[PDB]
Amino acid sequence: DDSAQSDLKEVMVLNATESFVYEPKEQKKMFHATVATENEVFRVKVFNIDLKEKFTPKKIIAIANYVCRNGFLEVYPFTLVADVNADRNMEIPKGLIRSASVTPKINQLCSQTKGSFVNGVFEVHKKNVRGEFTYYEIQDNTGKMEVVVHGRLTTINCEEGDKLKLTCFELAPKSGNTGELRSVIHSHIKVIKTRKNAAAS
Amino acid sequence: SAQSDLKEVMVLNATESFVYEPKEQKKMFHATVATENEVFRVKVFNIDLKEKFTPKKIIAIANYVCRNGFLEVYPFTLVADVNADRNMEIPKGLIRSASVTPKINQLCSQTKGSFVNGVFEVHKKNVRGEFTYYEIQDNTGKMEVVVHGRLTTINCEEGDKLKLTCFELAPKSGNTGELRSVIHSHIKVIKTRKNAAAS
Amino acid sequence: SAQSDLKEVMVLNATESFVYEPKEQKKMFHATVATENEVFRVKVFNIDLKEKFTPKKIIAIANYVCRNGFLEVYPFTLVADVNADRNMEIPKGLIRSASVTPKINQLCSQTKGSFVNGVFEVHKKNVRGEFTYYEIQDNTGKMEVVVHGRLTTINCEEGDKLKLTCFELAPKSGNTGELRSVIHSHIKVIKTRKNAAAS
Amino acid sequence: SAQSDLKEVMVLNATESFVYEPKEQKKMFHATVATENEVFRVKVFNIDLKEKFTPKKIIAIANYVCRNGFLEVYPFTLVADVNADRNMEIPKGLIRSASVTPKINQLCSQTKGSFVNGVFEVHKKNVRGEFTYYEIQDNTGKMEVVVHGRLTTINCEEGDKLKLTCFELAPKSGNTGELRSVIHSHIKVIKTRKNAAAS
DNA sequence: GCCATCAAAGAGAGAG
DNA sequence: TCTCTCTTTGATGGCC
């Protein structure tokens, strides 16, 4: 947000979610994407759902008239997204393409004293369903933590022993040197079910 | 001289479940656990307890058997998941000490026969009949591993390393002491640069 | 009727050296090699060649014995390094076709004897005397694997995977074939994590 | 285009002071400092500041010069201790990738020059006149490092590791790029097993 | 000398 | 089948 260059960017698209409704009442539909300049990696909120094709991964597009909010670039119907020519042939550093796809370790997120927004895959250890807020205890080799789900995201199917592919969840300061992750407006969850839990054909 | 009282311990490490007795098919795995004040070696004879012995899991252990400096866990032994509130803090210095490999000139000089665990460099190896002789060494000196039975069929070579478990130290006259594979013995072989299959 | 004329190849994969004959301490390793046209199964009886057998390496092999679909590489065999001049490119579909496990319903319906490199799941292991029978399974059906000798000593339990090299599929009445361990047979057993060692 | 505004940083590492220009006996040291959100290569030309540069210390810097990716600290530059109040948390990920040595596949193939730090093992060393060249290698490839001037007199043999600070990468036509000695170059030689002194 | 974290590769799950 | 992601393996820096 604050001091946001906002200047036009040249970026290849990395990975993207399918279109979905994050706001049930109005049926507001968005999708998430991560793109990168040769220099730096950005997370992307796309509120014009006609841009999915533009965002097909391995595709280089031009982006301008976008909003900077919460460390994200926000793309609207008025936002310019267009195909960049074959002249560039931009080569994006492997180290970054990996870091944008890396999942933050739990003990890091716990020890974290600052708020932020997280993507990553997480193993669900305990699932505690309470009213409109479902808690998923997630685990790794370095420790375990809590994920609170509310809003539309409560309706999904994730069982203890499944994995959550998290996209845009807030980390908030919580006493005890352990932080809690919260389901927010634009949050999206892809569930990875182990083969025993999934349907069979 | 033992305890046998119920203990809340956290599992450090557990081997795989293996057959130490091929005649009857009898199976076991070895584990290591800790309380605040010390570290225990565990021979677990109920291998359905494998899950429970997942490292970084705290459990209660009761009705086990202390034998030869081991706790032995049988199917009549109580092993159960501990109260989630615990959050025990286990001293680090003691983990190393439980995880430390004895020096050879220190072992070969042993007065009283013990059961050893440790990892070592294998220099010479000699096969005679139903026995296999490993000449092992480090900066302090050198000694021998004497393997027999099921283990003789294992693949380990010069420059390979033996990760050894419950091997009986049998002191000999004139610092000739040697390690021998006993009934509950287990080995992981950690190979050198390329000892193994690739791709 | 085997050509035996010198081939220049690239190394795809190779097993570690192992003792396939305990009595003599006879050792060998396996390797899959490739030209641009065809994939070859190598047996290597000189294990000091293991360095020339690094995967990705281009090499020439001459004066090797062709027996049973395999190229047998002995101490007198010619194995040397291939320079940058070659720069040979091997077809993806073929390099891939070499690493594919034949489906189980295929091997049964096969009325011909042959040799197989495959990975499978262990359905039911019934240990009987000095023999071990692993039922295996995939999407397309089920069958048996029959082990004997040194390979019975292996630790593979129901729920593990079997990496097999040089196993003989034999014609068997009932439109299902079996894989009988042979002398040069090799197995890498792949354990699920919950059964695997931990720390 | 570097900040030039005051920096609150913590000292990570530094070198000893050395004479980089023996004619006037000009002296300097290298240091690496880091803030919350990034790392900087520093050049310190008032050697009396070595005290201030203790690792694990927090200092403020301003009125420095940013040249060639380095912060240049002169006698006129402001260097002073940091308030006991600061308490800054520096990410391990940012430090670890400052202290990461480049792979040689990355360096030889660059079109443009920069100033490099790293640890490399020496393979071949051959000497001519005022010039000395070191072929270094890692898993990704191999290349040369050309040292003329004061750094020729260092003791480095084949097999030693070279720790370089501020050597210039000079790309050449067809992946021929190399690391050259400049006026601010520094080296520590990390000697290997049987090379160095004893008792 | 052991363990922390971390980058590159065989192999599994999805799709066209 | 072939592509993509991934669980898995080998390195490398830090503490006793």
Swiss-Prot record, chains B, C, D:
PTM field = Ubiquitinated by human herpes simplex virus 1 (HHV-1) ICP0 protein; leading to degradation by the proteasome.
Localization recorded for this chain is: Nucleus; Cytoplasm
Interaction with TP53 core domain: where is this region? 1-195
Q: What is the effect of changing K163A?
A: Impairs DNA binding
Tell me which residues make up the HIN-200 domain.
Answer: 1-190
For the cross-link Glycyl lysine isopeptide (Lys-Gly) (interchain with G-Cter in SUMO2), list the residue numbers: K112
Effect of altering R96A? Impairs DNA binding
Induction cue? Strongly induced by IFNG/IFN-gamma and, to a lesser extent, by alpha interferon. In HL-60 cells, maximum induction by IFNG/IFN-gamma occurs within 12 hours whereas, for IFN-alpha, only 10-fold induction was observed after 36 hours. Induced in vitro by dimethylsulfoxide, retinoic acid and 1,25 dihydroxyvitamin D3. Induced in monocytes by IFN-alpha and viral dsDNA. Induced by glucose restriction.
Q: Which residues carry this modification: Phosphoserine?
A: S4
Question: What happens upon changing K161A?
Answer: Impairs DNA binding
Q: Which residues carry this modification: N6-acetyllysine?
A: K27, K43
Q: Which domain of life is it from?
A: Eukaryota
Q: In which tissues is it expressed?
A: Expressed in peripheral blood leukocytes, fibroblasts and lymphoid cells. Present in myeloid precursors (CD34+) and throughout monocyte development, but its expression is down-regulated in erythroid and polymorphonuclear precursor cells. Present in prostate, ovary and breast (at protein level).
For domains, the record's comment is:
The HIN-200 domains mediates dsDNA binding via electrostatic interactions.
Per its database record, what is this protein's job? Binds double-stranded DNA. Binds preferentially to supercoiled DNA and cruciform DNA structures. Seems to be involved in transcriptional regulation. May function as a transcriptional repressor. Could have a role in the regulation of hematopoietic differentiation through activation of unknown target genes. Controls cellular proliferation by modulating the functions of cell cycle regulatory factors including p53/TP53 and the retinoblastoma protein.
Family under the similarity heading:
Belongs to the HIN-200 family.
Q: Quaternary arrangement and interactors, per the entry?
A: Forms homooligomers; isoform 2 can self-associate or associate with isoform 1 or isoform 3. Interacts with TMEM173, AIM2, PYCARD and CASP1. Interacts with BRCA1, TP53, E2F1, RB1 and SP1. Interacts with MTA1. Interacts with PYDC5.
Q: Identify this protein by name.
A: Gamma-interferon-inducible protein 16
**Protein's organism:** Homo sapiens (Human)
Q: What is the lineage of its organism?
A: Eukaryota, Metazoa, Chordata, Craniata, Vertebrata
